[PDB]
């Protein structure tokens, strides 16, 4: 899979205006959603060469596990009885199924009109046996838990498979969750592409959205190095 995207941001106060704009532009109001991601890295206690059976260089990378959680797990008592809609974001045995992903650093190129990232994904449906916890399974693969973050936001479905997410991110630790996006929302526009044509067509869709928001909110290509999960 190839994910083409553009990012942006707005401060908490820009919320309502942005929601109103995206609602008119797309024709639909926002849809609330969340996801928990846990990132894993090769066990540092174990050490293996970084080469193939064909003696070809392999770069060590992180594995990302992601799933959803019922919203009720994110609403405490103070949050109680508050319209379960877009406005809520302001006031902020076996294993379960998971999405397993390994991504590559975005495609190189000066003057790229969008970010383009390859993503290898498979789906974990269930487990059984002695150590069936997703954690044990990751260890069995030779990986260890590194960090994890929660993301809550609203999304918009647009034409040609374009999706827009307005998100807030919180890292999770016993010491406490800290909001990586403290201050506002991370804006993301993207399309997932399973032929050159559809790639240039997808770029166009993103470019038209960028064009349509120019003046109001700017969408740009983030730094490749900021989208590289390789271990080092």
């Amino acid at each position: 899979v190839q994910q083409l995207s553009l990012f942006g941001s707005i401060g908490d106060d820009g919320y309502d205006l942005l929601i109103s704009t995206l609602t008119t532009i797309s024709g639909n109001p926002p849809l609330l959603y969340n996801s928990l991601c846990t990132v894993w890295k090769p066990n540092p206690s174990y050490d293996v060469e970084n080469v193939n059976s064909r003696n070809q260089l392999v770069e060590p990378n992180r594995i990302k596990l992601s799933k959803e959680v019922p919203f009720s797990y994110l609403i405490d008592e103070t949050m109680m009885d508050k319209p379960l809609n877009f406005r809520i974001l302001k006031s902020f045995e076996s294993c379960s199924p998971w999405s397993l992903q390994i991504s590559d650093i975005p495609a190189a190129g000066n003057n790229r009109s969008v970010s383009m990232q390859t993503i290898a994904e498979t789906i974990i449906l269930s487990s059984a046996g002695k150590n069936s916890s997703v954690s044990s399974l990751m260890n069995g693969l030779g990986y260890v838990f590194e960090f994890q973050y929660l993301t809550i936001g609203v999304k918009f479905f647009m034409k040609h498979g374009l999706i827009l997410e307005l998100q807030k991110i919180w890292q999770i630790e016993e010491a406490g969750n800290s909001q990586i996006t403290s201050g506002g929302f991370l804006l993301k526009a993207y399309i997932n592409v399973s032929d050159i044509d559809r790639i240039n067509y997808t770029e166009t869709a993103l470019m038209n959205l960028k064009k349509e928001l120019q003046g109001y909110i700017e969408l740009s290509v983030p730094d490749r190095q900021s989208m590289d999960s390789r271990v080092a």
């Binding site: 205006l17 109103s20 704009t21 008119t24 109001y216």
Partner: protein, 99 residues
């Protein structure tokens, strides 16, 4: 509504402009009177002419502010259901069943 208030204000401004025009006319004719040696209208000539300028100045202050309010309202009050159909028919249906 708010838009109705804005439109009403604009209409009021139009009225003001009209007034300005009328008193422009008055001013002209009465200036014609003053040049002929009738000074009795000097109070009325200048009054209508001054009331014109005052009315025009008031309209200018009112109109310029209204334009500013429009610019400030961009994104706020101003842009930059089939479930309803169903309830109609169900209402209609239960009404047929129980007249």
């Amino acid at each position: 509504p708010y838009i109705q208030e804005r439109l009403k204000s604009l209409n009021d401004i139009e009225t003001q402009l009209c007034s300005m025009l009328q008193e422009a006319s008055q001013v002209t004719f009465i200036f014609g009177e003053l040049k002929r040696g009738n000074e009795s209208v000097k109070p009325q000539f200048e009054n209508h002419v001054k009331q014109f300028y005052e009315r025009l100045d008031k309209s200018t202050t009112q109109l310029r502010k209204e334009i500013q309010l429009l610019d400030e309202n961009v994104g706020t009050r101003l842009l930059p259901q089939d479930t309803e159909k169903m309830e109609e028919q169900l209402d209609l249906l239960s009404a047929i069943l129980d007249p």
